[PDB]
């Protein structure tokens, strides 16, 4: 996260770290949506242009964390993966359309003060809150600058951007399964996700019921925190029917 701040303890209890077993390293962010299911970006697991194709046994998820590098004894919980599910129309060949994946844990994780699931949006919450200017929150342990790494989880609040501005900021083809967020050059304030934050959550706190909803998944950006560029996020609600199909069948 660029131009963010340290999270408070328990501020993002749905935060998940995707961790490579060997070499032991941060791979991506992710989020806890139930005691057995974790949501992330498909490109965190499958990206053939970079020879990336992780299997369940390659990875662990670390839940309840605050420190990036420490083993947080008696606080974090480490879970093995039972199965990975990639969206069948995830477009890794072009523009990361439908950049979404689910991971089922081998055993349920115990909730605690530090471990708790986020809500997924309904149609009405999405329609009400996914408006230009409305702010969401992005969290992660990724790099602090494009060109270094945090001691603890970072948090930044960023406004959703009008779709024509998103489209006009890039040569990439933007789809309805993406939205973009970030400040404009003339707005003064700054902030973005960066490398290592992909797969983590963009959340909004509903003013109707005071619950946190995951509206986006950190998907892609051109650099980090560049003037005139924006971060792009998977539109969780648009893909929720797939999410529910996977959870219902498996």
């Amino acid at each position: 996260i660029v131009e963010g701040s340290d999270a408070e303890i328990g501020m993002s209890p749905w935060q998940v770290m995707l961790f490579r077993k060997s070499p032991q390293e941060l791979l991506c962010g992710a989020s806890l949506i139930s005691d057995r299911w974790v949501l992330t970006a498909a490109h965190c697991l499958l990206y053939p242009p970079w020879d990336k194709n992780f299997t369940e046994n390659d990875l662990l998820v670390r839940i309840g964390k605050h420190s990036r590098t420490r083993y947080e004894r008696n606080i974090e919980k480490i879970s093995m993966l039972e199965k990975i599910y990639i969206h069948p129309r995830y477009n890794w060949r072009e523009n990361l359309d439908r950049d979404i994946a689910l991971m089922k844990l081998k055993k349920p994780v115990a909730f605690s003060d530090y471990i708790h699931p986020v809500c997924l949006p309904d149609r009405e919450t999405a329609a009400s809150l996914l408006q230009a200017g409305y702010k969401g929150r992005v969290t992660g342990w990724g790099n602090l600058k494009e060109t270094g790494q945090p001691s603890v989880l970072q948090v930044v609040n960023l406004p959703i951007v009008e779709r024509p501005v998103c489209k006009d900021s890039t040569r990439i083809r933007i789809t309805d399964n993406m939205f973009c967020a970030g400040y404009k050059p003339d707005e003064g304030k700054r902030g973005d996700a960066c490398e290592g934050d992909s797969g983590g959550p963009f959340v909004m706190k509903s003013p109707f019921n005071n619950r946190w909803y995951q509206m986006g998944i950190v998907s892609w950006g051109e650099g980090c925190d560049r003037d005139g560029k924006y971060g792009f996020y998977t539109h969780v609600f648009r893909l929720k029917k797939w999410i529910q199909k996977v959870i219902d069948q498996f």
């Binding site: 986020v118 609040n157 005071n210």
Partner: peptide, 28 residues
């Protein structure tokens, strides 16, 4: 899922985090 999105150390105890008000103020 019944309790989703309600943080033990914040909403469950009626404590606010340091920047959630920024989000609320943007929901105009």
């Amino acid at each position: 899922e019944a309790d989703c999105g309600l943080r033990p150390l914040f909403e469950k105890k009626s404590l606010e985090d340091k920047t959630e008000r920024e989000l609320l103020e943007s929901y105009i």
